[PDB]
Amino acid sequence: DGWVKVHPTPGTMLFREILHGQLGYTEGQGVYNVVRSSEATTRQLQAAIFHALLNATTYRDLEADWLGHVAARGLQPQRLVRRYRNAREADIAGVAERVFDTWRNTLRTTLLDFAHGLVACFAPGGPSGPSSFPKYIDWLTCLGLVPILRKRQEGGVTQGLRAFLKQHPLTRQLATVAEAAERAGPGFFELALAFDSTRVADYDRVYIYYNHRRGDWLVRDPISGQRGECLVLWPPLWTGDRLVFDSPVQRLFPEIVACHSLREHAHVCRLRNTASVKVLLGRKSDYDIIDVSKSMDDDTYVANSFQHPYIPSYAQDLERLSRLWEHELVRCFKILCHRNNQGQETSISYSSGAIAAFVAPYFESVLRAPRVGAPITGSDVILGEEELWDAVFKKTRLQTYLTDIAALFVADVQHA
Amino acid sequence: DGWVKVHPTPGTMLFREILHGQLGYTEGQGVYNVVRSSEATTRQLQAAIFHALLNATTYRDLEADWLGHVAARGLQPQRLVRRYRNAREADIAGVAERVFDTWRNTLRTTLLDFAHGLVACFAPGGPSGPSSFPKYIDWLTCLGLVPILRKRQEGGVTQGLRAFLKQHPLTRQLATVAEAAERAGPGFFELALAFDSTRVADYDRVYIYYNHRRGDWLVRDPISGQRGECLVLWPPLWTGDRLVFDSPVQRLFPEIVACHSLREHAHVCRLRNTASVKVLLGRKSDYDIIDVSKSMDDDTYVANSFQHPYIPSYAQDLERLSRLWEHELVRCFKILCHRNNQGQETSISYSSGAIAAFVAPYFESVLRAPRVGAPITGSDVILGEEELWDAVFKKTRLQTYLTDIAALFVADVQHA
């Protein structure tokens, strides 16, 4: 009644089998390994966790902890000045600055350790299990559709967060850390539930239906009988008894088929020229391969015969396909290629817009995550975890408070 | 009832035999030797041990040890100033700074020696024996599955740790070293147990079963009858009476087979042209190789004959295959190639993302290790043991305490 099959047709399995390399392989197709990398999503998760944890800092409690540390050390400005009994301002100012610097560095490394501990719970479950990123990317590359299945339930990520947070000694050790953790807690649990709930379907099991007259999708899972919802990013085109997607493989499909047919024909022609000598026969009027035209003759004669051993060549077509594959995959997914002074492709990573165009829709619709803050740039992908934490730490709120307290302490260390 | 053989099929053994150069060898395939190196895991172990050992340092106890050293030397500020009896601040400050510098240098040397001694117990057992890394890498390269066998037991690593730790003179000599070792001890034992328990199955023994309907794995060891736990990073595809993996060898498989067949056909054609002259015979109407076609002639005649000694060429295919192998292995495993001003491939090592994508899951799942701290950078793989220890020593907790003590001593050496 207007419905039609979409995904499980063989003309769609052919696309995936092409993607696995069942129709030849090229150097250009090897760029696709970078496109599937889960580095961008892990960097985004690390940045989001760091922002959420460091945003809950407060000046009052951190100053209280600093005053408690000063009281523990017994190095108040009154006692220090009454002990030193000298007017050398530079020396005592440097002493106070170093005393503050030690505490600042220890607090920074403690916060780094806690942040890495928090990050460690999410990262492994991203690329594998429920809500897998490379599966999302290959869904996009093959069809442009991403079927998604949802169930509201708890599991590994939530249990991991509950086990990690509820007995970590740093919360008891530092009031500021515990306050920030309890303030930013609910967001972490909501993000964990978002990670757990969704699950992108598998390419060999799911069923997808399309009804042109209204333009809605019905996607079902035949094993469990579970109804899902279909996400569309680059909508297809319906031309009667057909349906043409606009995925990169669909655009690249005819060229590689033609090249494959050319290579097969060249192989067939190659196997023909094994024998060096050939013989031709015919009726009389009244290492070797022998041709017999004796039977078909009747009142005729062999007027003339020719030989021309053609062999098609296919190297130029393979070079063209390699370059075409590379250019298509670079321009479609916004891949930024780093280069040397003259050496080519020293490293490959996502561009600044590629993550905004691909990673952000993942977090926003595929996972339905609560928030991820301001997106990172295309240069923070290259940075390591420690470099990223240092980058976010300097520009965020906490550094301003830390530089604020030091100035006042250096000031009043000698005025009083 | 739906179960299918997966690994012991011949089409899987062919992949490993291809990996061992049974279908020809190329210069590009030689990059795979770097991919199997156990350098990254040893660097990660060294970094983890250094972080664990240095993070347990306590300011109070090392200050007490320094005060004990000062008491032993009899070089307290009171005695030193009362002996020198001069107002030359620069000389006395330099003397005190050198006195502290000798102690800090010898403490650094002692800590380095102890850290190397602790590291020496783990490193040999990594690449070989239980929990071998190159076997894991070639498991990933062949199929993408990593069957793993587990059994909780005590073994050589734990006995080595027990023999090394319980009678080391450094613990009795220094209170700081003993306290840090006692505090960090349980983690070392847990890591040793993690190293002992796991064992990656051998490629020529294990059995792997896959049931598409439900999608779970049953992996068994036929010799001991021990059931294992299967891991998957790059899930395969099921296309009816098949199973298509997405390992690099699977993607590269058709091309190398075509090249091998071309080379074999070229050899066969080459062996044919060894005779310079050829003779063709036929019935009369009413160093040499001679062809007899007179038997099949019957009321016929030889109308025409041809010769064309074809010899296929295969050098271009070999060069293309070498380049394809190299590019595939570079892009799939995220290999960073160092280069000269113009010279190519001065040295080859893991990139910053390669260790996070491959070394980190090994520790997380294959070993089930407790913790490894912050991951290292791809630039730290190049560094040696002493360089890595010095790198982790400067930015860790102990340096702040050591610099704090020096400034306070330099100040109080003359104000009192």
Numbering used by the authors:
A (entry chain a), B (entry chain b): 24 to 27, 29 to 310, 494 to 623
Question: What does the original paper state about this entry?
Answer:
To improve the resolution of the portal baskets, we carried out separate sub-particle reconstructions and refined them while imposing C12 symmetry, leading to portal basket structures at resolutions of 3.6, 3.5, and 3.7 Å for the A-, B-, and C-capsids, respectively. Additionally, an “anchoring” segment of the scaffold protein is resolved interacting with the portal baskets of A- and B-capsids but not D- and C-capsids. The C12 reconstruction of both A- and B-capsid portal baskets revealed a small hook-like density with large aromatic side chains and sharp turns wedged into a hydrophobic pocket between the crown domains of each portal monomer. This density is weaker in A-capsids, but still conspicuous, whereas it is completely absent in C-capsids, D-capsids, and mature virions. Indeed, we found the scaffolding protein residues 449–455 (PYYPGEA, numbered relative to pUL26) to be a good fit for the small density. Based on our model, P452 interacts with the essential residues W127 and L131 (both adjacent to W90) from the first portal monomer, whereas Y451 forms a hydrophobic interface with Y83 and Y608 from the second portal monomer. Furthermore, E454 from the scaffolding appears to stabilize Y608 via hydrogen bonding, buttressing the hydrophobic interactions between the three aromatic residues. Sequence alignment of scaffolding and portal proteins showed that Y608 and Y83 are highly conserved across herpesviruses, suggesting this motif is essential for portal-scaffold association. A- and B-capsids varied in portal height by ~2 and ~1 nm, respectively, could rotate up to 13 degrees relative to the capsid shell, and exhibited up to 1 nm of portal basket “sway,” due to flexibility between the clip and nearby wing and stem domains. In addition to scaffold-capsid interactions, our structure shows high-resolution details of the scaffold-portal interface, enabling the first atomic model of a portion of the scaffolding protein and revealing its tightly packed, hydrophobic nature nestled between portal monomers (G and K through M).
A unique portal vertex exists at a 12th I5 vertex through which the genome is translocated during assembly.
